[PDB]
């Protein structure tokens, strides 16, 4: 029984490392630079301690997404000359009254000493008046606006996070996993499938669903200060569009630099509205509330209210379908009381100057999309925030929250975990080296 | 085999196709393999054809993979097939130049006869379908004639010509 | 072929049977740097294990029994039960606090073996 | 018979990889990054299949030169403020009539709230008028001009393209190598020879002369759309100069940002020209005709005509002579008809705001008089498609695709990847 | 002495004499990253071959004998015309459609030989 | 006899490698990006030749410091719109009269077509008049001014220079080592002792002291053109302060642009000065002259005078501490002629527009630091320069020189040297492989 | 234990006993790329020496005895003076100008031994 050496033994230790991307038109997330993907191995009698809220993959993905977002904004047009006094008037070709502003401003041409008086349409959320009236862009006193490249697409292309050689990613396949604790059924896949870098709040769009029933995953179900990632088993399809027939007009800011204005509108002016099947949403809410009654008691009243308040990005459901950023008002979704063919319409609002990652001093102007935008997605999860109670009430109010994109991407990298292999193993065995 | 129709004076945009979406060297030639236009790296070179002063390609479109052939001031003799050689293909389109007009420019009276003149390219079979505001949708061969001319017969007649399921609208001068 | 680390729940005999696949999988713009440094990290991590194997006299051998005895206890147990039911992960957990000493003993034993062989080869 | 493993056997496969530079004070082609150069081993009894027109090395060198030029231009001055209205008049201090324009504009001084009235001589090909008339920079409504830093030089310095470890570069020494097919004499070199990355059209300059006779290499000689790269054996010298005694005047267009602009032409105004020995050029064209008749027949009339037309960089022999970008009208060179002391002068034109062969870059004026002598080591001819019934083959100078200039120097080379792991049967058996 | 790839046209037996010449040449802004990535690629490509040699029981060897029989399906040529007339390039071309099978066979033969070895040493 | 290959022999050769950094708000040297540190192993019996004048580490650290300085100024504000015509007037609220200028200028605003008449306090060394008078920024006709980011601190944080794997760093431990020649006491330490990258002239501040005796180190002690790096054995602490109570005022010069200009001084205006103990400095000068006599004869008259002339950086003791760059006239320190409670006050002048590395076309604007700055530092050495003697005079005059930062960093990297391990060796013995 | 380079002053016979200590330390934004290229450079420098060891038939062995005769033209001193008086530094300084021919001799001898072994095993 002398010390013997074994190489290639299957032993791992939890550790953090840099994971590259593999992806099966350019995008803000450079999937073209990712390696071409190709492999699933089951692990018998293994018990692995997972933790969705201490997973380093979430922070790594958030940093990578931010870096890819602000990298693609570097070679694009910089809209510094746009920060001028805009003489704006109401469009007047309707509930979208005043929400489309007709603004004219002095403008530089290819010659430095020649001025030009051009016009462009700006949404009311994109301009703030200065005390026809004088207006300026909403982000002329905080951030430098950098117009997004017209060719670069914002479409979420799936990416796969493959660990480097000598590392493995353990994928828990338990169908009743609350995000924390040992997972008695683990697998081992070198990459991560079904990862879509979608940006949204209060509604996880185009995500990966649960397997059998709606999962309530929270770090602290008792502490109300933490979010509650709900995940759906059956998708709730969302239908919505921008009925306005927009026209994109190119205005020169200077030599070889075009500012794609909003031009003019063709047809009638209609509010951007998001539609969810009322029966589908009601059934999904019933299933979800049945799930929450598990952690709060059967005789506990569950109440759903709209967002409490704050920034428009966290107050309203804000996605980016079609290249135009929506800020849909979800007050008509979470409004009910639960006691033990028609479609709900959501009055969205549209912005163009966006500061996605709550970054101070860096914003982006989204070029208007020509034609009519229609996007169909389906909600695979919610981000609810239980309000603080008085600990003596029967009702519990769950208002959608969010704002932390990491909380969105934690709904996908919850089942994975990166480990470092220790293939060198010492043990006793009846050998003696001659 | 794509076919397009001209109007004897306007421009025509015959487009090559590139699968690599990049600046692949291409060359436009007619049926006699006489070079007309061509990419050379990032610059443009024109072949020793009869379209020296007319042929042109939108240099800004070459990056996306579109290599058009703009032919300004179309002429009746310019009707021929043209070939792309983007990578190894023979993307071939045919250009037909139709010239339709009338001999009686302005000198006309009431109750007289009107005659048209269609100049079809050699080696083609056109079909003229005239249209008039009063409703004489005259059908006939290459040459069309009108026997009634009155004050009611004013207005521009959008007489368009058909060949191989392709139709091109014209305009005519009628002042009474 | 239980798979890459597939035998992690199997017996240590079964794992020692399938060490080769684990041995062969240890080597093979925002994404550009994460790709390059991942490759560098993988290469250096594999080379560290190879070098540690080399200075113990176990180069190129997946299994290499050595002369260093089982000093003290080090959770000795017995050879029968350890390789019949116990899994590799638990075993690594038990002796995680004596690994450096074991490595040092192996290094010194290999150096002694090389010196003795060089001494006896000159006779 | 048992399987035996051999590691380190002479076996290679065609592959594409990243080859780094090894050059032999700042240059647009980096000299502070290329590893210092350090060799040739003949390979008997080997025949390797080469291919010029599908070689990855030319594409990689093209990308490298583009990246070097676009990287050495970033820390340079930006000339967006030059986009103003230029009140311009003709200079009158004979051939250069109305070709040098005496513009004068309003430009911002080092202070943001003060203006300065300065004047500069702009070439005719560099200003387009707006209907003393008002002008503007030619590349002002579609691209931003960044002046080339005067402290960096466009001097073509030879660079050696070395293959990384584990790869080898095969060099075909067959002196009658036409660019495609098996090469019966292949040699291995650590790095390629000195490759002067000259930028030129219609006339390969400064290249490596071919031995034996004037070799003609084409991707498909029968096709009338493939550049017929010609390589000489006896170089014909070309003497290009700009007689103007130019002087450089510095304008402050911003804090710490200068703009070197043409000032006053001291002395007479004369046209930039190039001289080629008429007898030597006639002999070289005769040799090219003799070697070209082999591919089209002996009785076919070989005719040379000037460029058919297009952009100025294709229709004229353009090159960099010491900093100033010439554009020489070679109509007097390719003008002959071949059937079975005096110097030719080419009237060249000089542009400052040139369009890069990739955005435009402004070459600052060079102080003094420029003269340079170069070797014409090859042409780039493009055949004119025939009607199949005529016995004449008119060749016109092409070029413009800068990959063809570097394909006349990377023709003998080929990158291979060494695969040293081999297996073969022997009677041996492990104990 | 011939030099790098000097015996590339020589016969198989004659070219097998100079394995070290091709063996020791397998390891050694815009140009900076091209240098760094090329170095990493060369290191990885050398380590790949070294690991393939290691899992065949041929680690640290240039000419390594194995225990896998040579099936006549891959090549029916005899030793005389293999080692006396053909060139290593031709041999690589002939068996290039069977290399994966031979590599896998070497792998399994090596692992069975190893496991038989630890079975023997347990006595 | 037969050759035998020994692997891992203690054999090294002189070499140059790319040493990396390691150290224990965001800093200007980006010491956070360095790998955390943790060491010394004595090398008996060995003799190694050291040469600090041919030490590649001083050049490597010079390049590294320059690159770190230039890298942290990229994301900072570019003060191009500051280059305007200033209408300055004298400030009046002692001897600081005609030193601070009250400059009022036209500055752009968030809106491009709007202006803003702001005012600021610029020091007399920051402005040159144009020929109330009209001034302008001093580095306006030669360089582009880039204001340093206010959240980036110029504090000298200790950094360690660790050689990569396969290389070793030798450390000369001879207590009387004169920077050239063999060191009979060498040690191998992986990471340097921790070099504070302090930029200064005429006085090596916060440096590492000698062990036994004040060491005089020169490349050629007989050559007058080579500086004479002095190193003290005991520190001479220097008390530097800026009595003016500065008030920082933010001026918006564009979208997301924040120019920080001096406001109104709260209180009285006084000259910033550096206090040095007179008795301590006299004793230290006595020790320096005592040891320096060993290289010029015991009957030599050693004299100290003020600087010869040149730019303000080399004429006066320039140093940065607290964020405000001082330039201390040091004629009060070097005035003595040495033959065989009170304090010294050095008047200092403060600049804001700095060009630290003598580079043409690049400058920095150090934003004002709020409040009164008090700054305590050690004087651990000088950088003297011997003037050209007449070869027949008994008096030797030394004037403080410097200006080459490599001289400052050569006083810390003097005992260090990087070697390359050659572990492969061949030696004959009676072996024979069987 | 003397530590890294601890026996740099000790004699050859005494410094040849701690070769493992100097062997295990041979492998393990302005600062980021410097760290990365330092890692890559260390890996290359270790791998070239390991390849040199493995080419002479000494892979994985610190003290390998080989068949190349010690030519007296390199050093005429006896073993009593070499292994008991001089340390490794002056020895490396002494024969630093004869090392390439020694490396070539070792390479050729190892290749010859490999071919001889393969020929012997075929009987
Ligand atoms: C969730 O996934 C759906 C399905 O992929 C997304 O809808 C898709 O959105 C893209 C982007 O606009 C559409 O592609 C575009 O189509 C138009 C023509 O309609 C074309 O002109 C554009 O160039 C572009 O190709 C795509 O048609 C559409 N698919 C469907 C079935 O509607 C949706 O945007 C995703 N939601 C989120 C929040 O990412
Ligand atoms: C334009 O819209 C604003 C916002 O509702 C409103 O206050 C204003 O009265 C409108 N102007 C006119 C002329 O109706
Ligand atoms: C999650 O589940 C584990 C065991 O399944 C349990 O120990 C833990 O308390 C649970 N936590 C939450 C927040 O549900
Ligand atoms: C809706 O969810 C289903 C569930 O698998 C999925 O197949 C579908 O792709 C989702 N919708 C969209 C637009 O992706
Ligand atoms: C200048 O030269 C141009 C070019 O020939 C000519 O048209 C013009 O009349 C000349 N004179 C002036 C005043 O432009
Ligand atoms: C070109 O100039 C060189 C140097 O003055 C001279 O030797 C050569 O003969 C000239 N050739 C021609 C054609 O002018
Ligand atoms: C080439 O082949 C001939 C013919 O057998 C042979 O004599 C010669 O040695 C070979 N050369 C090489 C380098 O293998
Ligand atoms: C400011 O004070 C200095 C001190 O001498 C004086 O020379 C200068 O004229 C003063 N400036 C004004 C505007 O009074
Ligand atoms: C410097 O200031 C310190 C206070 O921090 C004081 O203790 C010391 O005595 C002062 N020294 C001199 C020389 O003024
Ligand atoms: C020297 O160090 C002290 C304390 O660490 C600090 O207050 C002072 O600013 C430093 N001096 C310089 C010039 O960095
Ligand atoms: C020069 O030295 C003398 C010594 O008597 C001293 O009085 C004087 O102040 C010094 N000059 C200075 C400090 O400027
Ligand atoms: C140093 O040398 C002396 C005399 O040669 C010897 O006695 C001693 O052991 C040596 N020490 C070391 C550490 O080599």
Residue numbers in the entry:
A (entry chain C), D (entry chain A), F (entry chain B): 34 to 57, 65 to 78, 82 to 136, 148 to 185, 188 to 309, 312 to 321, 321A, 322 to 397, ...
B (entry chain Z): 1 to 176
C (entry chain F), E (entry chain D), G (entry chain E): 519 to 546, 569 to 663
Share the article's original sentences.
The HIV-1 Env glycoprotein, a heavily glycosylated homotrimer containing gp120 and gp41 subunits, mediates entry into host cells to initiate infection. The viral entry process is initiated when gp120s bind to the host receptor, CD4, at the CD4-binding site (CD4bs) located distal to the Env apex on the sides of each of the three gp120s. This triggers conformational changes in gp120 that expose the gp120 V3 coreceptor binding site, which is occluded in the prefusion conformation beneath gp120 V1V2 loops. To investigate the role of receptor stoichiometry in CD4-induced conformational changes in HIV-1 Env, we designed soluble Env heterotrimers that can bind only one or only two CD4 receptors for comparisons with Env homotrimers binding either zero CD4s (closed, prefusion trimers) or three CD4s (fully saturated CD4-bound open trimers).
We used single-particle cryo-EM to solve structures of the BG505 HT1 heterotrimer in the presence of CD4. We found three classes of HT1 heterotrimer: class I (132,550 particles; 3.4 Å resolution; density for one bound CD4), class II (68,508 particles; 4.2 Å resolution; strong density for one bound CD4 and weak density for a second bound CD4), and class III (260,558 particles; 3.2 Å resolution; no density corresponding to bound CD4 molecules). Weak density for a second bound CD4 in the class II reconstruction indicates that this map may represent an average of HT1 Envs in different conformations bound to one or two CD4 molecules, with one CD4-bound Envs in the majority. Owing to heterogeneity (class II) or no bound CD4 (class III), we fitted CD4 and Env trimer coordinates to only the class I CD4–HT1 reconstruction. We found that binding one CD4 primarily resulted in a closed, prefusion Env conformation that showed only subtle indications of CD4-induced changes. However, the HT1 heterotrimer used for the structural studies here did not include mutations that lock Env into a closed, prefusion conformation. In the CD4bs region of gp120, the CD4 BSA footprints were comparable for class I CD4–HT1 and CD4–BG505. Residues in the CD4 binding loop (E370gp120, V371gp120) together with T257gp120 and exit loop (G473gp120, M475gp120) residues maintained analogous positions in the class I one CD4-bound HT1, zero CD4-bound closed and three CD4-bound open trimers. The class I CD4–HT1 complex showed an intermediate orientation of gp120 β20/β21 loop residues, with the N425gp120 and M426gp120 side chains oriented similarly to their positions in the CD4–BG505 complex, whereas the W427gp120 side chain adopted a position similar to that in the 1-18–BG505 complex. Thus, whereas the overall conformation of the Env trimer in the class I CD4–HT1 complex represented a closed, prefusion Env, the gp120 Phe43 cavity showed indications of structural changes consistent with CD4 binding.
